[PDB]
Amino acid sequence: HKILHRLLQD
Amino acid sequence: HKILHRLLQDSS
Amino acid sequence: SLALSLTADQMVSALLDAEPPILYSEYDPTRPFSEASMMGLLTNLADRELVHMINWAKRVPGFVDLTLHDQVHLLECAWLEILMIGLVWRSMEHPGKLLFAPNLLLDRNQGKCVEGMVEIFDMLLATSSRFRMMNLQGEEFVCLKSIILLNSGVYTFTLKSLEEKDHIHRVLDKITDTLIHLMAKAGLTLQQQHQRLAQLLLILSHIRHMSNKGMEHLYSMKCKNVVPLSDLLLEMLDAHR
Amino acid sequence: NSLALSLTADQMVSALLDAEPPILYSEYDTRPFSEASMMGLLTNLADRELVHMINWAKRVPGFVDLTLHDQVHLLECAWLEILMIGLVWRSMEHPGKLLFAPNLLLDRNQGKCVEGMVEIFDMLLATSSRFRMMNLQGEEFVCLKSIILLNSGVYTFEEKDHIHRVLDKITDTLIHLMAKAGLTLQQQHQRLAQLLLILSHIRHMSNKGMEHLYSMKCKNVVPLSDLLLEMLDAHRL
Ligand SMILES: COC(=O)C(C(=O)OC)[C@H]1CCCC(=C(c2ccc(O)cc2)c2ccc(O)cc2)C1
Ligand SMILES: COC(=O)C(C(=O)OC)[C@H]1CCCC(=C(c2ccc(O)cc2)c2ccc(O)cc2)C1
């Protein structure tokens, strides 16, 4: 769960 | 000084 | 896919509508300049820009059609390039200066004070001059920025995939169509169209070059624990490693 | 006035084809390689190729019209890109393999003895495969290689205007080749874009390569020649 990974999901 | 100088000037 | 069904004009409208805003830096004109604070300003700014970039990327046609892991990879490869072409774009009407933010306008001499910054500053200034002389249009700029996003990581992504690259390449072809469409609309001849197209894409090589140099300097910042990198920037940097 | 701009598209193509450097061989000596022997062979080979690259560069239309200083800058900027696109071109007909020389054909497995080599090898192989699936023609290749020479250093400088006008000529020539091959107008500018975007990747590989070359100099194990040292110094300073 990268930071980039998460922000792309929101 | 610079080999590249010599190579360009004697180019063929 | 909806991206491949867009007309040229709808592509442009989509991209333009999705443009991120121009952010401000926390630059305090009273504060004495220092190498530390200057790099802190640019870093803080880039970090807030990244959030807008990530959400902008979602609105680039085709990007959402991709899997999440591929989305991550493309942004990891492209983010500094995209920040840089944005900076160069903002700086077009300020010859000899880089408009990092409306309240942070830097000239060549303020480059220096930070080591290694001069060389890249000149490279960014040259790119800005190039865009100015070419009279780059806003419509062309958003196309270029989308190309960078889709293209920069495409060669460094096994099977039950690959058709992912094929889809990205199809979207990329659509953006080329859109660029050509813009140019024909502005009255350029066919010869002029393919020339300008080449000119714009060749500039992307220089932008890649500048990102690579920047990424090198970014690492030098990290293991020289002075100017703190944000948690998002740190993870991006690890990706280039 | 430069005679490069007066050339027709066919004259440009024939001039570039004729200027093509020879394909050199590696040392004919035992497997597997070590890190020292691997880097030895590649370094020796690149060094000999460099001498021929200069001859080729002087025969690229427009290049002779530049000052010595500008000629030096462009080659210093572009030499590893030029070696790499040559390597990638040679490897096209050998999927999964890098044809450094006719007697030096490597796969990704033989890269493991050198740090970061597998990573760049994969990037080079991806590029070759891309050229192969695009069915890149030799006429297109020599245009791309000349573009790299003239473009890569041009924004690190009436003489820039000259380079750009020659670059425009080479674009005209690429389009002429694709039209000649029967491509539609849309297929022509799509293909042009596809090829020029690959150049961004070639730039990326050269930069990664230049980093490793610098660290190979610092390690002081694999001897770089004076010519390569001067090429290398030019990029870090
Ligand atoms: C020391 O070498 C340099 O100065 C470059 C560098 O890479 O800094 C680490 C610097 C050069 C100007 C452009 C650039 C910026 C930058 C570019 C565009 C932008 O909108 C906002 C910010 C940057 C600085 C710090 C950071 O953590 C992330 C990005 C990078
Ligand atoms: C991780 O390090 C690497 O493997 C790269 C490198 O940079 O070496 C340090 C290597 C990758 C493959 C291409 C390459 C070459 C190379 C490329 C094309 C060619 O015809 C002849 C030679 C190279 C090697 C050593 C040298 O002194 C000059 C050029 C560079």
Side-chain angles (χ1 to χ4, degrees), chain C residues 39 42-47 49 79-80 82-87 90 98-100 114 116-118 120-121 124 210-211 213-219 221 229 233:
Chain C
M39 291 308 301
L42 306 184
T43 297
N44 180 281
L45 175 64
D47 179 71
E49 288 185 277
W79 70 268
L80 187 51
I82 292 179
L83 288 185
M84 284 180 169
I85 191 178
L87 166 64
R90 299 195 293 282
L98 295 173
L99 194 144
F100 281 87
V114 178
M117 167 174 282
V118 200
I120 305 191
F121 261 37
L124 294 156
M210 290 187 295
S211 174
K213 292 295 178 178
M215 218 70 70
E216 230 176 334
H217 283 131
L218 255 179
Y219 171 75
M221 271 188 52
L229 286 74
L233 278 174

Side-chain angles (χ1 to χ4, degrees), chain C residues 81 122-123 126-127 130 133 147 151-152 155-156 169 172-174 176-177 180 190-191 194-199 201-206 208-210 212-213 216, chain D residues 81 122-123 126-127 130 147 151-152 155-156 161 164 167-169 171-172 175 185-186 189-194 196-201 203-205 207-208 211 235:
Chain C
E81 283 180 274
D122 282 341
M123 290 190 290
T127 310
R130 182 53 178 162
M133 173 162 292
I147 286 171
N151 178 66
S152 286
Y155 296 115
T156 49
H169 282 130
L172 276 175
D173 286 342
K174 261 285 183 175
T176 300
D177 295 339
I180 290 298
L190 268 308
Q191 181 185 7
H194 69 233
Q195 283 181 5
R196 188 175 178 85
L197 177 63
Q199 289 164 7
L201 299 185
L202 284 185
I203 291 169
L204 294 192
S205 179
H206 183 232
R208 177 76 65 106
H209 183 66
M210 290 187 295
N212 289 156
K213 292 295 178 178
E216 230 176 334
Chain D
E81 288 184 85
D122 285 345
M123 297 191 302
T127 310
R130 181 80 168 112
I147 287 172
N151 177 63
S152 291
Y155 303 119
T156 41
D161 187 85
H164 284 122
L167 280 172
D168 285 353
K169 248 294 174 177
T171 299
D172 293 343
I175 294 291
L185 205 50
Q186 189 185 26
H189 61 68
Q190 284 185 4
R191 183 174 181 84
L192 174 67
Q194 288 165 2
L196 296 185
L197 281 185
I198 290 168
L199 297 194
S200 281
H201 186 239
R203 178 81 73 133
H204 188 73
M205 295 187 286
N207 287 331
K208 286 293 179 178
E211 285 185 276
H235 264 228

Side-chain angles (χ1 to χ4, degrees), chain D residues 39 42-43 46 49 80 83 87 90 100 115-117 120-121 124 209 212-213 224 228:
Chain D
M39 296 313 305
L42 301 191
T43 292
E49 287 186 277
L80 187 53
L83 285 183
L87 170 67
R90 291 194 301 276
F100 278 90
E115 182 198 28
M117 178 173 283
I120 298 199
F121 269 23
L124 291 161
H212 292 121
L213 282 171
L224 287 168
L228 271 170

